[PDB]
Design a protein around this ligand. Structure first.
Ligand SMILES: [Cl-]
Ligand SMILES: [Cl-]
Ligand SMILES: [Mg+2]
Ligand SMILES: [Mg+2]
Ligand SMILES: [Zn+2]
Ligand SMILES: [Zn+2]
Ligand SMILES: [Zn+2]
Ligand SMILES: [Zn+2]
Lengths: 186, 186
């Protein structure tokens, strides 16, 4: 349903000099194109996170991005309509998730994917390749700014009427990250 | 001297339902491109306001935007280099100022202009045309959000170490204005 406020603050914080944000949270919403305008679909919104590994071991816990792809077919989107699916993510995807997402959007031309991320995850391995591959397949990847954090608080958090409280350095971090993303995607 | 805090708050407040904000304040900053990166030239920053009419009458007081254009030649920018000049304005320009600013940027290709405005001034005459013409000439026009107000407070105001305290409604007014600006520029 709605995210717990402390969970939001801990996970969407874009501060560079802290650690421990090991989870990925993903909030999604959907619009449909009508008369050159994106119209929000009321019911098609939610959030999810990565899953814990199963007790049997061997396999990693299912990543948030794969869960996201799992749910989309259940929305019964009309293949003749055009949709914009926006994901607000606390981290950008790992390589294998990026590859899967790229495959999905290549096969589902009715979906325009936008990924707005709090933080870039760059393992200095294949993460950059993944992001480039995902953008090549048509995804629009960007860094969350104040307005997107506030939107996510208002739309996905169990705020009980309380307003979004920005943290110190929010815009400076977003700007640094936007520059880093430009360098990855160039 | 830096800007007086009450002067900033009075003039940059984005509530539409008060009156009396007859001045326009304009805060400016300049960056120079150095090896693919914008670098601030912090000596080239400042703020100004519109002028009172002369006692001889007939002519309106000189608008802030024209004063801004007046000073740019005195910065001795290098015509062979590239600069980004950002203005944070309390009101967007009137038609005749927008026209003059469009002419200036058309003749000064070393300058990329960004105008970030607290409020839209729409006289229901030629103001919208002015904004469209200024955008067409290459200016990037946008509405100030929390982050830009905070930046201006921290950078241009004699704050005495006090943090920026947003006024009621800041984000909702900014969002409304961003919608209005989209409709104007489309
Ligand atoms: Cl972390
Ligand atoms: Cl006013
Ligand atoms: Mg920091
Ligand atoms: Mg209000
Ligand atoms: Zn299992
Ligand atoms: Zn993954
Ligand atoms: Zn005179
Ligand atoms: Zn004017």
């Amino acid at each position: 349903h709605s995210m717990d406020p402390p969970t939001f603050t801990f996970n969407f914080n874009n501060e560079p000099w802290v650690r421990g944000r090991h989870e990925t949270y993903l909030c999604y919403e959907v619009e449909r194109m009508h008369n050159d305008t994106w119209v929000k679909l009321n019911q098609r919104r939610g959030f999810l996170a990565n899953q814990a590994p199963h007790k049997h071991g061997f396999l990693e816990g299912r990543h948030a991005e794969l869960c996201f792809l799992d749910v989309i077919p259940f929305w019964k989107l009309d293949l003749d309509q055009d949709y914009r699916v926006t994901c607000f993510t606390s981290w950008s995807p790992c390589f294998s998730c990026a590859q899967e997402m790229a495959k999905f959007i290549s096969k589902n031309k009715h979906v325009s994917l936008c990924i707005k991320t709090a933080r870039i995850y760059d393992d200095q391995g294949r993460c950059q390749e993944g992001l480039r591959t995902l953008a090549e397949a048509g995804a629009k990847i960007s860094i969350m700014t104040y307005s997107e954090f506030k939107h996510c608080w208002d739309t996905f958090v169990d705020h009980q009427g309380a307003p979004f409280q920005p943290w110190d350095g929010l815009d400076e971090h977003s700007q640094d990250l936007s520059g880093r993303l430009r360098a990855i995607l160039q």
